[PDB]
Write a protein that binds this DNA or RNA. Structure first.
Ligand SMILES: [Mg+2]
Ligand SMILES: [Mg+2]
Ligand SMILES: [Mg+2]
Ligand SMILES: [Mg+2]
Ligand SMILES: [Mg+2]
Length: 224
RNA sequence: GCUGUCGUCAGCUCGUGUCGUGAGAUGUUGGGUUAAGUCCCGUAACGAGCGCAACCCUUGUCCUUAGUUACCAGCACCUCG
C-alpha cells in the first residue's frame, strides 16, 4: 500500500546480478552496488490486480490454496492461512498432490481416522512400545498433510510464495489448468504464472506483507 | 504331482502419477544405521503386494493347580529295602 510499506521492508531488492533471469529485465529498475532492484511503481498495479482478483473470487464459495514451504516462511503461512479458511502446505510439497489426487485421498482418510483414533478418548490404553510408533506416524502425516485436510475437491485457484523453489507445484497446476498467483523474484520466470507479483523473497517482513494482503483481501471478499 | 539347486542370499514386483518419439526410467537413487529393501532423514513421487521381522516348537528362571505307579523334609515302625 501507498508505496511506503513495501519500499520500507525489503521489496526493492534482488538476488545480486550474476544470477538473474533475462525475462526479469523488464522489471528491473536498476542494479545499485551489484544488486538488482525491482521497479515497484510497476509492481503496484499488478499487486492490486491480484488483490482484487482474489477478493472477487472469494465471493462464490471458491477455495484458494497457499504454498509457502521454505525456511522461516512455513510457520508464517501456517498461522496466516489459519482463519479465513483456505488450505496451505507448510513443509515439503509432495509430487502428485494435484495430478494424482486420488492416491493422496487415501492418505487424507488415513490421517483423519488415525487422528480420530488417537483422540477418541485415548484409545491407545496399552504399552507405549508401538504407541510411540503410532504417534510418530501421526505427526509425520500431519507435517505434510495438515493444511489440506479439508477441500475434498480441487482448488479453483492457487497462491505461491516463490516460484523457483516450488516449480513442481506450478508445473502440475498448469497441467491441471487452474489459475495461479505467484511472487516472482528477480532470478525467476514468468512462465506458468498467470497473475505475476514481481515482489521479493527471503525477507520476512515482505512475506507477511504479501500474505496479510491476501488474507484480508479474501476476508473482504468472502463476506458477501 | 513331488524334489534338488543358486540360497534362508535380500531381494522381486504392481497400481496411480511424472519424464522420454520409443525400448524404458522414477519409485527401489542419496547420508547414516541394521542380521535384513530394518529403521531415520531427505527426496516427482505417492501407495501396495510377495519376501525380512512377528505369530509356532524346544531350551534356560519363577508362580498356580496337581501327588499315583512319581518324591521323601519332618514323625514313627523298620527285617534297615
Ligand atoms: Mg509421454
Ligand atoms: Mg527400475
Ligand atoms: Mg532392485
Ligand atoms: Mg520390508
Ligand atoms: Mg521368519
Amino acid at each position: 500500500v501507498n508505496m511506503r510499506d513495501m519500499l520500507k521492508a525489503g521489496v526493492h531488492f534482488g538476488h545480486q546480478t550474476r544470477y538473474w533471469n533475462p525475462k526479469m529485465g523488464k522489471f528491473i529498475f536498476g542494479a545499485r552496488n551489484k544488486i538488482h532492484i525491482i521497479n515497484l511503481e510497476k509492481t503496484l498495479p499488478m499487486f492490486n490486480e491480484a488483490l482484487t482478483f482474489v477478493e472477487r473470487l472469494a465471493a462464490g464459495k471458491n477455495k484458494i490454496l497457499f504454498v509457502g514451504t521454505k525456511r522461516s516462511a512455513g510457520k508464517i503461512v501456517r498461522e496466516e492461512a489459519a482463519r479465513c479458511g483456505m488450505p496451505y502446505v507448510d513443509h515439503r510439497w509432495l509430487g502428485g498432490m494435484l495430478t494424482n489426487y486420488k492416491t493422496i485421498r487415501q492418505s487424507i482418510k488415513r490421517l483423519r481416522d488415525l487422528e480420530t483414533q488417537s483422540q477418541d478418548g485415548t484409545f491407545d490404553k496399552l504399552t507405549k512400545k508401538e504407541a510411540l510408533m503410532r504417534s510418530r506416524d501421526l505427526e509425520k502425516l500431519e507435517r505434510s498433510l495438515g493444511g489440506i485436510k479439508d477441500m475434498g475437491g480441487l482448488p479453483d485457484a492457487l497462491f505461491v510464495i516463490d516460484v523457483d523453489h516450488e516449480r513442481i507445484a506450478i508445473t502440475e497446476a498448469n497441467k491441471l489448468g487452474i489459475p495461479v498467483i505467484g511472487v516472482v523474484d528477480t532470478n525467476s520466470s514468468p512462465e506458468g504464472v498467470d497473475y505475476v507479483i514481481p515482489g521479493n523473497d527471503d525477507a520476512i517482513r515482505a512475506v507477511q506483507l504479501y500474505l496479510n494482503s491476501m488474507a484480508e483481501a479474501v476476508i473482504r471478499g468472502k463476506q458477501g
